Amino acid sequence: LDLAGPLLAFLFRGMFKNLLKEVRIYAQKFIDRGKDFNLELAIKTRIISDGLKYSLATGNWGDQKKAHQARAGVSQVLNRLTFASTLSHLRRLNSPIG
Amino acid sequence: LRRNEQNGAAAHVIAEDVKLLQFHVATMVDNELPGLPRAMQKSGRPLK
Amino acid sequence: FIQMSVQRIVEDAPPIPPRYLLKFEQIYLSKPTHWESPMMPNEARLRNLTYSAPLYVDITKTVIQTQHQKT
RNA sequence: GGCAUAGUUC
DNA sequence: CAACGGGCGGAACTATGCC
DNA sequence: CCGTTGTT
């Protein structure tokens, strides 16, 4: 059973990899000139922030560009009709079978 | 393609452009052929 | 997840004539705050905000060492 | 305005 | 005999994210 | 799952 830990860790691995790719690209572009290099300007926090926020907001578990094979149905909006509804929503499983 | 065929091309730009126009027209007719680029416009959503 | 998995993911990432090398050391997490200041969950609900905390990291810059804290 | 996803009734 | 393509219920009601 | 078309 993939709970919040495994789900968010799998999601975060890709975003950290993308952040490393972007800082690498920026460093190479700024270093081929040979002038200098900076760290803060090389890091795009928007990647991690927007990626986590989007995946939690829509439920399509993956990157926005590839929301075709992304498995939808994770991260539903909490049911608040009754306390029993809230509890039974918070303790719920799912079989990805079609 | 009209401009290229007027000003003269390199005998392969014309062929590539012909293939590209063929792809665009074919996808306009039907966008579900097996083994095609599957043209999109924005946000990754395929056309209709 | 917060205690172990993010740290492991940071650590297992491979590090990236003059040469430059970087190596991320360890992470940090403050309690959730709002930037315009702690942000309470009810305020996050009322103002259509997002309840979140910032993640920092130590990154070391070397030329062939210089330390950058709380990136 | 439209696209998508989720839940529910019979 | 093997590869390819089309086919797969009916209605209805809310909500949320995004172009 | 099973109707077309190819290959052999």
From Swiss-Prot, chain B:
Superkingdom of origin: Eukaryota
Subcellular location: Nucleus; Cytoplasm; Chromosome
PTM comment text: The tandem heptapeptide repeats in the C-terminal domain (CTD) can be highly phosphorylated. The phosphorylation activates Pol II. Phosphorylation occurs mainly at residues 'Ser-2' and 'Ser-5' of the heptapeptide repeat and is mediated, at least, by CDK7 and CDK9. POLR2A associated with DNA is specifically phosphorylated at 'Ser-5' of the CTD by CDK7, promoting transcription initiation by triggering dissociation from DNA. Phosphorylated at 'Ser-2', Ser-5' and 'Ser-7' of the CTD by CDK9 (P-TEFb complex), promoting transcription elongation. Among tandem heptapeptide repeats of the C-terminal domain (CTD) some do not match the Y-S-P-T-S-P-S consensus, the seventh serine residue 'Ser-7' being replaced by a lysine. 'Lys-7' in these non-consensus heptapeptide repeats can be alternatively acetylated, methylated and dimethylated. EP300 is one of the enzyme able to acetylate 'Lys-7'. Acetylation at 'Lys-7' of non-consensus heptapeptide repeats is associated with 'Ser-2' phosphorylation and active transcription. Regulates initiation or early elongation steps of transcription specially for inducible genes.
Family the UniProt entry places it in: Belongs to the RNA polymerase beta' chain family.
Entry's free-text remark on domains: The C-terminal domain (CTD) serves as a platform for assembly of factors that regulate transcription initiation, elongation, termination and mRNA processing. The trigger loop allows entry of NTPs into the active site, switching between an open and closed state with each NTP addition cycle.
Protein's job: Catalytic core component of RNA polymerase II (Pol II), a DNA-dependent RNA polymerase which synthesizes mRNA precursors and many functional non-coding RNAs using the four ribonucleoside triphosphates as substrates. Pol II-mediated transcription cycle proceeds through transcription initiation, transcription elongation and transcription termination stages.
Subunit structure: Component of the RNA polymerase II (Pol II) core complex consisting of 12 subunits: a ten-subunit catalytic core composed of POLR2A/RPB1, POLR2B/RPB2, POLR2C/RPB3, POLR2I/RPB9, POLR2J/RPB11, POLR2E/RPABC1, POLR2F/RPABC2, POLR2H/RPABC3, POLR2K/RPABC4 and POLR2L/RPABC5 and a mobile stalk composed of two subunits POLR2D/RPB4 and POLR2G/RPB7, protruding from the core and functioning primarily in transcription initiation. Part of Pol II(G) complex, in which Pol II core associates with an additional subunit POLR2M; unlike conventional Pol II, Pol II(G) functions as a transcriptional repressor.
The protein's name in its UniProt record: DNA-directed RNA polymerase II subunit RPB1
Organism encoding this protein: Bos taurus
UniProtKB/Swiss-Prot annotation, chain C:
Subcellular location: Nucleus
Domain of life: Eukaryota
Function, as annotated: Catalytic core component of RNA polymerase II (Pol II), a DNA-dependent RNA polymerase which synthesizes mRNA precursors and many functional non-coding RNAs using the four ribonucleoside triphosphates as substrates. Pol II-mediated transcription cycle proceeds through transcription initiation, transcription elongation and transcription termination stages.
The family this protein is said to belong to: Belongs to the RNA polymerase beta chain family.
Assembly notes: Component of the RNA polymerase II (Pol II) core complex consisting of 12 subunits: a ten-subunit catalytic core composed of POLR2A/RPB1, POLR2B/RPB2, POLR2C/RPB3, POLR2I/RPB9, POLR2J/RPB11, POLR2E/RPABC1, POLR2F/RPABC2, POLR2H/RPABC3, POLR2K/RPABC4 and POLR2L/RPABC5 and a mobile stalk composed of two subunits POLR2D/RPB4 and POLR2G/RPB7, protruding from the core and functioning primarily in transcription initiation. Part of Pol II(G) complex, in which Pol II core associates with an additional subunit POLR2M; unlike conventional Pol II, Pol II(G) functions as a transcriptional repressor.
Name of the protein this chain belongs to: DNA-directed RNA polymerase II subunit RPB2
Species, as recorded: Bos taurus
Gene name of the encoded protein: POLR2B
